[PDB]
Amino acid sequence: TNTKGKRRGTRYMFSRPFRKHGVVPLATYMRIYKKGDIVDIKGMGTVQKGMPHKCYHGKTGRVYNVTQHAVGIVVNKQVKGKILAKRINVRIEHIKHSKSRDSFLKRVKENDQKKKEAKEKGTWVQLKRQPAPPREAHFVRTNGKEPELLEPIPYEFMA
Amino acid sequence: GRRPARCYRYCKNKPYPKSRFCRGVPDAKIRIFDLGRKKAKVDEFPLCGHMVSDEYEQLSSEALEAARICANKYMVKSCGKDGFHIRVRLHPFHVIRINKMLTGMRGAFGKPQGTVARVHIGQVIMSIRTKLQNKEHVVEALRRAKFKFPGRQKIHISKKWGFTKFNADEFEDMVAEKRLIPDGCGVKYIPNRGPLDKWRALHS
Amino acid sequence: FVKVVKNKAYFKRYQVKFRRRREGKTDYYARKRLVIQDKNKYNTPKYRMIVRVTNRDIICQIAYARIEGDMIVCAAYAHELPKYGVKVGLTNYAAAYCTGLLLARRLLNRFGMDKIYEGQVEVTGDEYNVESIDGQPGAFTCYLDAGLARTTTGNKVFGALKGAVDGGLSIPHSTKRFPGYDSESKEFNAEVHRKHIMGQNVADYMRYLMEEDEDAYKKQFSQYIKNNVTPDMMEEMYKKAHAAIRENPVYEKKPKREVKKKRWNRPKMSLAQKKDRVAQKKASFLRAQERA
Amino acid sequence: ENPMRELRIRKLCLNICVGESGDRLTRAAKVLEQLTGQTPVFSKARYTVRSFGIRRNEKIAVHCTVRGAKAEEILEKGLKVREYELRKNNFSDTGNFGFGIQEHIDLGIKYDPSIGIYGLDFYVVLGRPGFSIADKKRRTGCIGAKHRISKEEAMRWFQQKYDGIILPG
RNA sequence: GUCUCCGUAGUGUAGCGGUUAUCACGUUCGCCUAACACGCGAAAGGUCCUCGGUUCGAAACCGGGCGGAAACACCA
RNA sequence: GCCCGGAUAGCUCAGCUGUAGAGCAUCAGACUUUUAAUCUGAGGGUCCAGGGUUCAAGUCCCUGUUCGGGCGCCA
RNA sequence: UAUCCGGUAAAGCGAAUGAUUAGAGGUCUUGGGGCCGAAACGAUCUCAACCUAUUCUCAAACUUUAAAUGGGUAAGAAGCC
RNA sequence: GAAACCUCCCGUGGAGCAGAAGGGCAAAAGCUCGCUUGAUCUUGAUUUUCAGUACGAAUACAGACCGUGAAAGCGGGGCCU
RNA sequence: GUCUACGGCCAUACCACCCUGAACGCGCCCGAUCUCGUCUGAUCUCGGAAGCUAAGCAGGGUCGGGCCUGGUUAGUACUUGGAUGGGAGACCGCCUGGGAAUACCGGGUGCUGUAGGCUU
Ligand SMILES: [Mg+2]
Ligand SMILES: [Mg+2]
Ligand SMILES: [Mg+2]
Ligand SMILES: [Mg+2]
Ligand SMILES: [Mg+2]
Ligand SMILES: [Mg+2]
Ligand SMILES: [Mg+2]
Ligand SMILES: [Mg+2]
Ligand SMILES: [Mg+2]
Ligand SMILES: [Mg+2]
Ligand SMILES: [Mg+2]
Ligand SMILES: [Mg+2]
Ligand SMILES: [Mg+2]
């Protein structure tokens, strides 16, 4: 049976990628996490203080606390057959804003624009998303040149 | 002295090479991978034939040796002492364990028996180079070697010039153009990325 | 010969250092500690009092740090000090004070805390700092940013700090590094500082030289002797400048125009030109070797 | 008609590696102090060697960098002792050079049956104006290329400045 | 195979991380003897089994190599 | 854990708060043809470590480290 | 549909670590053995390790690369203003 | 003298960081100095094993009192497991 | 056109050698009285402004290495799901969808924020 040590099997997990070792580039720190902000956790070798546990790497969650240089950050964790929402304090370095949400918001803002407009006009526009549809009828013009034949080609043993 | 090659034929395990970990590995049979006139230039031997496998199997080091020998011996007796060059092309690296029996199955992870190759379907085993006179000898050299291996291998007599990575129809042409340049048993490919001082060594 | 050290291999696996580390400018260890904020403060600034001395100049700026690039609210250089009264010896401690003070007043007029937060008008040199007023807007607080200076005692940086402090910025410090502070005793003369602040340590040098040797004094203090600036005209002069700076700091720039727009520099050579050159070079090689 | 590629002397490094410790060492330091007019600095051992009889961190040698005029003059002396002959091998590829004097009384000092005769060893470090960018703190860098002092270039300097010979072999 | 221990001048052995590696015998060279022995004075001689490590430093401490020796191998 | 005991020159041991004893061992003189044996001198003690009491401690005091003899034994 | 995570198959080893064949080129270093040399980086070979470009074949406890399948969020009234 | 000490040049780290390995680390997390006891006093929260109980281990805060530094800050034991 | 100070992203910015640098800068530079620190004013600290772009620095150059980004490699290797497919096994072919990495060959070789200069 295995060892229950904390870092076990994070040889390539907490490992600063090829030619990105060394100093934690400042932006990282000087960017701001509020309550309600959604964040994807991702460990980082260099900063060890406040390193999140290996189960929560890649896992993504919401920020419920903000201390001087850390964030309490609710995440989900499937334990056998009963997912636990649970709350982990992570230092900023092992944390990024998730963009998952940004694209939704972008689309909300676009709807509220297209709702204000096209109200005075009268025409109700399709706001909802709609799945990638069947690819329509259309012509293919083969101008002049007829389509090229493709013979399957003989076998010959290369090596 | 040693187990029969039935039992260590198939690629059953991950490769287990003579490392930090697998140590005490007794040496391979095969040491000498190339023989003939290995001091021959590319121009004076163009005609590889490449015994090429068709299983996904392990060939014993002991087998390789025998095959190589059986091929060399036939090449000499046929064409001449120095009329060719051979190149064995499967070094045994996989170490192959052996739980010996004087307990039972209790803690039975083997000591190392020996070394062995791993050959993919279409990997070359042995390739010979010699003259355009010689090809019929070459094949029979390889034919006879085949019997010293398990599985199946197909002798094939193969487009490149020499041992090189270049197509033999183009090879005669290239050399004058000086894209290719002689360099022992091989040939160096000089390409126009160059600093021009390199270009000025040639053409002069 | 030896094994070549810097092979392809070397360069392949080789990581550059940060650009300003490469230049030899930013100390990123400190930068981090200095500059970034607590998160529970959130967006709110953390200001610096950058102070950098250059061979002939003293630059003093105030900056917080946004993710895009740390921003200068307000800056005053040494070479502005002519307007006010300082004509030479502008990289020196006294000028640093002037600069640093200048920077303070300038910054305190922008927020309109000019009339409030005078600070220290008399130039004692003593431990001083600004108690923020109640029923009033608080004092501006930036932390000193020393760069790569060995921050011993006497380091001009702490002059410009002093200056700013006396100008009315709440910068924390200790006096352990102002000129004066006696290492092997551990107190502070303050008057010793004042002297340095006013240029007497320069003035005294001047006097000691003229006594000793004319030719040395003339070589050392040419632009000082030119402009007619003596040891006994000196303390006054600085005090006048502080008075000018204190009374009207605001900057005006110069209305720059009438630019011809000629390329001093040399532009990058287009692919085809480069592709040409080798053609020519090969042809040239060929024609040369086809003679002898 | 160059401006400031004025091949000068950066430092003259002297040292006396007695490799004993105790008296002979502090007795040698008196030789450098006399010579140079500045307290020298001891250098302790890297690591223990039974073959030489030196322990790790045992003060083995005493040495002294001298710059400016006093370095020049002491270089002058040393060369007088070596009668202005050096060898090609005494000039390093990097542009510097050295030599040893076999005994310090030949310079200009008086023997004492106590303070015996320390042999010592000069090494001249040639420079050029603007060679400080190496070793300053803030905007460090190399020192270009055409600025570095060639083995050739030093030899001719020495040949020129001190009338030296630079014998072959 | 398991577990154990031991590998040091020619021989048998001491050796407490800083030694000129100890003791005895043997060897060589003087004397003593007519000769030899005994005896006396001198001297020479260790790849510290091998390789790697730790250590400022290993003959020893730690690991693996080649040698060598005891105890176990029982219940059907 | 409780009592007690020894630690001193290479070794074994004396030592009553004011050159540390004895014997052997170690080295130089006699003796010996020479060696041994023996007689004479000579050298050699961090008195196990630290702190105290004391004008002054190898000793008196405590505290440790050992070392052994006996007792003793609830997480 | 957006958006992170990952270091497995594969691949790579003219990229790091390790492993490994061969010839070209190198008094690099120096040697141990030679042959022709009193001896000589003299001439000539050689085998040792090191180096310059090349080349043969490898990795469960190597890796620049790097999939498929796979795991997180998000897709509104607890939201927008 | 292959090894002593001195000097210059090259050096992405091939060293060092008590120990196994793996991660991490260069105006440092290495070395050297200077001062020091945050290896102190105390509420709860959380992670890790988890049953999502303990122990141990750790992560954020909060209040005391201090160290250090010009300061920003950093420190309530050992770069992390 | 371009610099300085503080920067973000961190090689399209690195390395090597070569040329070119107006004005402002930034430099080297010349000193040791004070401040401060050294075996040494070399570094550090301070006071300067006689020289000079030699160097740093900047811009460019190089059928340059490196890095960057395309193509090729290859619908190759692999791989999700499927079959009373094949094959003595080893393995392979198919269906269904997903799809790499070298060698090789091209192109690229810093962008940019705040504040303040010069070219008036
Ligand atoms: Mg059988
Ligand atoms: Mg198996
Ligand atoms: Mg600092
Ligand atoms: Mg794995
Ligand atoms: Mg694989
Ligand atoms: Mg530090
Ligand atoms: Mg606290
Ligand atoms: Mg530490
Ligand atoms: Mg100077
Ligand atoms: Mg220049
Ligand atoms: Mg130039
Ligand atoms: Mg290129
Ligand atoms: Mg079925």
From Swiss-Prot, chain A:
Q: Which domain of life is it from?
A: Eukaryota
Keyword Magnesium in annotation:
no
Looking up SUPFAM superfamilies in the UniProt record yields: Translation proteins SH3-like domain
Answer whether the UniProt record assigns the keyword Thylakoid to this protein.
Answer: no
Region ranges (Disordered): 111-144
Chief place where the protein resides: cytoplasm
Q: Which UniProt keywords apply?
A: Cytoplasm, Endoplasmic reticulum, Ribonucleoprotein, Ribosomal protein
Q: Which GO terms describe its biological process?
A: translation
State its role.
Answer: Component of the large ribosomal subunit. The ribosome is a large ribonucleoprotein complex responsible for the synthesis of proteins in the cell.
Protein name, per record: Large ribosomal subunit protein eL21
Q: Which organism does this record belong to?
A: Oryctolagus cuniculus
Q: What is the lineage of its organism?
A: Eukaryota, Metazoa, Chordata, Craniata, Vertebrata
Q: Which gene encodes it?
A: RPL21
Swiss-Prot record, chain B:
Q: What subcellular locations does the record give?
A: Cytoplasm
Q: How is it modified after translation?
A: Citrullinated by PADI4.
Family listed = Belongs to the universal ribosomal protein uL16 family.
**What gene, per UniProt, encodes this protein?**
RPL10
Organism from which the protein derives: Oryctolagus cuniculus (Rabbit)
Chain positions of cross-link Glycyl lysine isopeptide (Lys-Gly) (interchain with G-Cter in ubiquitin): K178
Which residues are annotated as modified residue Citrulline in the UniProt record?
Answer: R31
Protein's GO biological process: regulation of translation; translation
Q: Which CDD domains match?
A: Ribosomal_L16_L10e
Location of cross-link Glycyl lysine isopeptide (Lys-Gly) (interchain with G-Cter in SUMO2): K165
- Decide whether keyword rRNA-binding is in the record: no
Q: How is this protein organized at the quaternary level? A: Component of the large ribosomal subunit. Mature ribosomes consist of a small (40S) and a large (60S) subunit. The 40S subunit contains about 33 different proteins and 1 molecule of RNA (18S). The 60S subunit contains about 49 different proteins and 3 molecules of RNA (28S, 5.8S and 5S).
Checking PROSITE patterns in the record gives: RIBOSOMAL_L10E
This protein's superkingdom? Eukaryota
- What is this protein identified as? Large ribosomal subunit protein uL16
Task: List, alphabetically, the InterPro entries matched.
Answer: Ribosomal_uL16 (IPR047873), Ribosomal_uL16_CS_euk_arc (IPR018255), Ribosomal_uL16_dom (IPR016180), Ribosomal_uL16_euk_arch (IPR001197), Ribosomal_uL16_sf (IPR036920)
Q: What does this protein do, in the record's words?
A: Component of the large ribosomal subunit. Plays a role in the formation of actively translating ribosomes. May play a role in the embryonic brain development.
> Among its keywords, does the record have Ribosomal protein?
yes
Q: What is the lineage of its organism?
A: Eukaryota, Metazoa, Chordata, Craniata, Vertebrata
Swiss-Prot record, chain C:
SUPFAM superfamilies according to UniProt: Translational machinery components
**General function of this protein:** Component of the ribosome, a large ribonucleoprotein complex responsible for the synthesis of proteins in the cell. The small ribosomal subunit (SSU) binds messenger RNAs (mRNAs) and translates the encoded message by selecting cognate aminoacyl-transfer RNA (tRNA) molecules. The large subunit (LSU) contains the ribosomal catalytic site termed the peptidyl transferase center (PTC), which catalyzes the formation of peptide bonds, thereby polymerizing the amino acids delivered by tRNAs into a polypeptide chain.
| Record keywords, A-Z | Acetylation, Cytoplasm, Isopeptide bond, Nucleus, Phosphoprotein, Ribonucleoprotein, Ribosomal protein, RNA-binding, rRNA-binding, Ubl conjugation
Span list, region Disordered:
251-292
Protein family according to the UniProt entry: Belongs to the universal ribosomal protein uL18 family.
For bias kind Basic residues, which ranges apply? 256-266
**Linked residues for Glycyl lysine isopeptide (Lys-Gly) (interchain with G-Cter in SUMO2):** K218
- Detail the disulphide connectivity of this chain as listed in its UniProt entry: none
A Pfam family (short name) is Ribosomal_L5e
N6-acetyllysine PTM positions: K3, K46, K218
Query: Where on the chain is Phosphothreonine found, per UniProt?
Result: T230
Q: Which residues carry this modification: Phosphoserine?
A: S183, S270
Indicate what this protein is called per its UniProt record.
Large ribosomal subunit protein uL18
The keyword Acetylation belongs to this UniProt entry's keyword annotation = yes
- Cellular component terms per the entry's GO annotation: cytoplasm; cytosolic large ribosomal subunit; nucleolus
Report the subcellular localization: Cytoplasm; Nucleus, Nucleolus
> Which GO molecular function annotations are given, in alphabetical order?
5S rRNA binding; structural constituent of ribosome
Q: What is the lineage of its organism?
A: Eukaryota, Metazoa, Chordata, Craniata, Vertebrata
Cross-link Glycyl lysine isopeptide (Lys-Gly) (interchain with G-Cter in SUMO1) maps to K218
Its GO biological process terms?
ribosomal large subunit assembly; translation
Curated annotation (Swiss-Prot), chain D:
Under InterPro entries, the record lists:
Ribosomal_uL5 (IPR002132), Ribosomal_uL5_C (IPR031309), Ribosomal_uL5_CS (IPR020929), Ribosomal_uL5_dom_sf (IPR022803), Ribosomal_uL5_N (IPR031310)
What GO cellular-component annotations does this UniProt entry give? cytoplasm; nucleolus; ribonucleoprotein complex; ribosome
Respond yes or no to whether keyword rRNA-binding is given for this record: yes
* Superkingdom, natural source: Eukaryota
Crosslink Glycyl lysine isopeptide (Lys-Gly) (interchain with G-Cter in SUMO2): position given as K30, K44, K146
Record's signal peptide: none
Keywords from the UniProt entry: Acetylation, Cytoplasm, Isopeptide bond, Nucleus, Phosphoprotein, Ribonucleoprotein, Ribosomal protein, RNA-binding, rRNA-binding, Ubl conjugation
Q: Which GO terms describe its biological process?
A: translation
Main localization is: nucleus
Described purpose of this protein according to its UniProt entry: Component of the ribosome, a large ribonucleoprotein complex responsible for the synthesis of proteins in the cell. The small ribosomal subunit (SSU) binds messenger RNAs (mRNAs) and translates the encoded message by selecting cognate aminoacyl-transfer RNA (tRNA) molecules. The large subunit (LSU) contains the ribosomal catalytic site termed the peptidyl transferase center (PTC), which catalyzes the formation of peptide bonds, thereby polymerizing the amino acids delivered by tRNAs into a polypeptide chain.
Family note: Belongs to the universal ribosomal protein uL5 family.
The protein in question is named: Large ribosomal subunit protein uL5
